[PDB]
Amino acid sequence: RCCHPQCGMVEECRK
Numbered sequence: 001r002c003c004h005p006q007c008g009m010v011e012e013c014r015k
Contacts, residue, residue: 003013
């Protein structure tokens, strides 16, 4: 999925 700060990843991605 898009876990990028640009997409709006409210939760810090694992990678």
